[PDB]
């Protein structure tokens, strides 16, 4: 729990490119975000292991003052990597520029119950919210706290290169090269560098990425290949961590037959999971049982499950009178979602009154040329957004809320079930004291309908040397956490 930096230093593969900058407002992309746990702090973050909150810059747990304001306190001490103070003013400035439509920032859908962020006074700051919230201290994560003066004196430059109050300050960042960090000897928080300098080579091409761990180039690799996965573990730590991110089974709810449930549910009938999972993925992912990855702290098995049935599924194609079924299911270019629809392809094409066809896509171009535009029948596609949080609520809103996947996507808001889920999802966060059981009913409606479903959730797998790191845990996200590991 204690390791002195000095000497030790740590270097990474990463598997995915730099592909937005380091703002916290704009970078979405997984290896900025995950540059970010090092270089940025939230009032509260959220442990990128275990996903549960810990007190970053704030002093203290959240004052509920009443049932709708906050105060919340800086920790004493804190600075940013220039070596000016963190101050409440910044506070402020970080929640109302990712807020400020005009920076049309991502993470502002993931706080829209807050009114108002005000500075009390030099220590603690006030958060006024629209209608009470029992998840507020879980959403403090996604709003890294920036130094304004930093940001404003250019907010390009700031972009390029981040100034935080994290444990590792950025020192330099090359595109398909590396991210250089080294320890911020000024840090009063709870995870200081173990480490003083950093170093994530980016390693995109799998042949390299599993050569620099082999030859002891790099202590730890994310995204190991499936099939390499056991000659790594002679020598190293390999782990196949459960994830969110899941491939789901979308459908057109407003174009026939998908209007039906029951083909809905036939179609995912069908579907050989066991089978998908050993081929395509060996092993390294999980047939959904319920919305949530089993291993999530608040799964429960839904009530509907779609266990391989063929014969379930022609029943239902039958009972909801389908003389023939042909349609083209569309599917991204991932190269692992290319080994999957063919297999999903196969197995539809096997029911009696069923005929399909395959047009790989790429994202933009299936989205925009074709779901948007609702020239679009079915979909499978990949999506993940628990690397901005874990909650229920988080994890339900982001497919099931709002106009932007019910109205404009799957076109299931005109119906009875989803007014049902949309009164559950306001209920759940009025009070803790009925949430798991309105999240709970929503998603046993979610599996019953099936309008957008997960087909599996994937495993992670990540490649590590216990001989030279110590404490690393892998992600059940992208990305790589060295908050709290150190070298031997």
């Known amino acids: 729990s204690f390791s002195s930096p000095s000497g030790s230093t740590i270097e990474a593969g990463i598997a995915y490119p730099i592909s937005t900058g380091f703002d916290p407002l704009t970078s979405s992309g997984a290896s900025s975000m995950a540059a970010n746990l090092h270089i940025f702090e939230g009032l509260v973050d959220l442990h990128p292991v275990t996903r549960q909150p810990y007190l970053a810059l704030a002093a203290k747990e959240p004052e509920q003052k009443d049932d709708l304001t906050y105060y919340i306190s800086l920790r004493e001490g804190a600075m940013f990597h220039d070596g000016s103070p963190v101050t409440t003013e910044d506070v402020v400035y970080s929640f109302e520029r990712v807020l400020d439509p005009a920076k049309a ?10 009114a108002s962020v005000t500075a009390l006074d030099d220590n603690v700051v006030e958060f006024k919210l629209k209608y009470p919230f029992a998840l507020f201290k879980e959403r403090l994560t996604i709003i890294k706290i920036v130094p304004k003066h930093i940001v404003e004196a250019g907010q390009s430059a700031f972009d390029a290169k981040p100034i935080g109050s994290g444990p590792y300050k950025f020192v330099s960042a090359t595109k398909d090269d590396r ?33 620099a761990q082999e030859s002891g180039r790099v202590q730890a690799i994310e995204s190991v290949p499936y099939l390499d996965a056991e000659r790594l573990k002679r020598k190293n730590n390999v782990e196949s961590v459960q994830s969110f991110g899941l491939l789901f089974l979308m459908f057109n709810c407003e174009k026939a037959p998908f209007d039906n449930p029951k083909v809905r549910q036939a179609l995912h009938y069908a579907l050989d999971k066991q089978k998908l999972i050993d081929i395509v993925f060996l092993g390294n992912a999980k047939a959904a049982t319920s919305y949530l990855q089993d291993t999530h702290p608040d799964y429960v098995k839904a009530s509907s499950q779609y266990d391989y049935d063929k014969a379930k599924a022609e029943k239902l194609l039958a009972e909801a009178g389908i003389t023939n079924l042909t349609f083209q299911l569309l599917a991204t270019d991932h190269a692992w979602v290319k080994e999957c629809a063919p297999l999903i392809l196969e197995s539809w094409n096997a029911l009696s009154v069923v005929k399909v066809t395959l047009q790989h896509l790429q994202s933009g171009a299936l989205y925009s040329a074709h779901v948007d535009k609702g020239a679009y029948e079915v979909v499978i596609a990949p999506g993940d957004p628990s690397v901005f949080g874990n909650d229920l609520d988080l994890l339900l809103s982001w497919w099931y809320r709002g106009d932007v996947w019910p109205k404009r996507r799957f076109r299931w808001a005109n119906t009875a079930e989803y007014h049902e889920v949309q009164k559950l999802l306001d209920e759940a966060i009025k009070n803790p004291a009925g949430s798991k059981v309105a ?50």
Do not use: C
């Not at 920032?105 to 807050?114: G, H, N, V, Y």
């Not at 994937?458 to 070298?487: E, I, Y």
């Open 439 to 488: 999240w709970q009913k929503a998603i046993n409606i979610i599996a019953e309908q099936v309008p957008l479903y997960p087909i599996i959730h994937r495993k992670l797998p990540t490649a590590w040397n216990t001989k030279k790191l110590t404490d690393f845990q892998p992600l059940p996200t992208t990305g790589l956490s060295f908050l709290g590991v150190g070298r031997t």
């Open 179 to 211: 991210i250089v960090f080294e320890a911020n000897t000024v840090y009063n928080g709870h995870y200081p560098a173990k480490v003083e300098k950093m170093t994530w080579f980016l390693l995109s091409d799998d042949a390299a990425r599993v050569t």
């Open 105 to 114: 920032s991502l993470f502002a859908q993931f706080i829209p119950f807050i």
